[PDB]
Amino acid sequence: FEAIFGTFCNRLEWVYFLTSGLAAAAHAIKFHDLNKLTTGKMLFHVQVPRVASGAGLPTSRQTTIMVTKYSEKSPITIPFELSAACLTYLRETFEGTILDKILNVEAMHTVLRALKNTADAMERGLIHSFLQTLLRKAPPYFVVQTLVENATLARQALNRIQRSNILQSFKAKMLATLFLLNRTRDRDYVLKFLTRLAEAATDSILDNPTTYTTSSGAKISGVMVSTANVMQIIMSLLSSHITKETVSAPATYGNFVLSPENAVTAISYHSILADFNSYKAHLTSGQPHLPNDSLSQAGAHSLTPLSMDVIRLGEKTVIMENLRRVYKNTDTKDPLERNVDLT
């Protein structure tokens, strides 16, 4: 005889956007009516201090700039398929025999398993798309370092010599740092490179002050991601500064909804101003400044803890995570494995 031992079905592992460290880089708000609109704009009003000039020299003027920020759309899709057998047996019975019961169980489990797999794939696609939009906008290291060294040296639109110097710094630092981990491993150099890379970015506009806090110590600021190999190298090298920690994260998406005064303006003038009643109250009360923005109001309330790695770059704390899990056995190439070419 021929013996068949135990048959195994794959124990597929689930993953979520919120449970991943990348969620700390993100603010997540859920909005059931998103399909209808295609425009999202924010506005910034800033007045720049002017130092009182000395005698004889040209004097400054009271000056302001007004700037707006716009929305990027990037919907994601996943198909899944059902055969005729499942579709016809899911809604039919034949004589009520045992084999028909087996077929019904198989069809129901097949369709529900397909739905579960599609939901997991949709979550993976959402985190993938967020990484896509984050990485497509991040500039490289040498340009941001050249910018951070030149902060004071321009106070106007760039003149010719200044941008020539910018280009010189570009070329020098590009030759200096086209690769990092393969060239030098003296821990001081790599740690100082990491802290420079962190300090280069400007901080976020809207803090969620009671999110992604360390369990007791302090508040987290940055999130950085790499493939498993680079993460292993860094963890081996920087072991003195590496710590384990439990952090608090929002357990669910934040809910944002239309108040009726928003709906009437939607119908009338094709526009909504968020947190409308707060605007009307603080306007008629004659007060200039609001406690919170609508986005921060939309933020979720409950907190749940989860474990992740964190290191110190000097008064700044940044999150470690390697995204190998989200593409462990999938199709698409992990976006963090980039190709760079030279001439």
């Binding site: 579709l87 809604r91 129901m108 369709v111 529900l112 739905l115 599609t118 949709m122």
Partner: protein, 290 residues
Amino acid sequence: MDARAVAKRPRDPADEDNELVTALKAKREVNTISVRYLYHADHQALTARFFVPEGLVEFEAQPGALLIRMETGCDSPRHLYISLYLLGIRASNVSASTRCLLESVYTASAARAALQWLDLGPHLLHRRLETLGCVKTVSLGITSLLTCVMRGYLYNTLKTEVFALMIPKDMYLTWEETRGRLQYVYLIIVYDYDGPETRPGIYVLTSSIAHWQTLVDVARGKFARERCSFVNRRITRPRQIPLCTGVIQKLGWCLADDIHTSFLVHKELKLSVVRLDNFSVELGDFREFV
């Protein structure tokens, strides 16, 4: 079988649960997906998906147009999906201004290759082309996605609005002064054999006539000059084998009151078109008349 079951009213998809809802009800499980109501569930129109190069998409960025499949004998992509508006650049039934405008607008690289393939072969346009009905979405890029209906009422996803079909003004032809409330619309190709080239004309014809014999009778009546040209080339130049002074294809039924005249804008250039809003597609094959 029982009398009550036979007499019972027909099954009601109108309020009965969708299959996914039935399964999730059965196991008592909930996914994050808004599983209850399926989009396109009530759709009667048959939909196809087509990929096209970026050059041809112009004038399709506005929804509604005839999408035509043209042949090329090369090993590499054998078919190219072309729009009726671009096809007018070849027809001799287009005014000089409109042809110049279309020639200026479609000057993308891919379009001119299709124009070369159209006239680089011995065969006429009749054997080379085939119709795919009406196109109704855009997703731009280096390669763009089109979705198209081949047996349809022409509508947006939620059916929130009907989508019209636009025909360029120079091609539009009518053979009756009064219109019955129902009339069909056809695609018409005729050939001029007197010129050195087999010079083709492109026409779109609306008529209240559904029966083939009388429609062909009227067509031969109006196209008498072209028929005489065919006979003249046949007698004049032996060992040549011309055929089918004109061909007909049936493409549409529409309610005559719906017809309107409208302008169409793209690349801030302005085109003149005729418009049919409450349109539907019925597709037949090409057929020959002499």
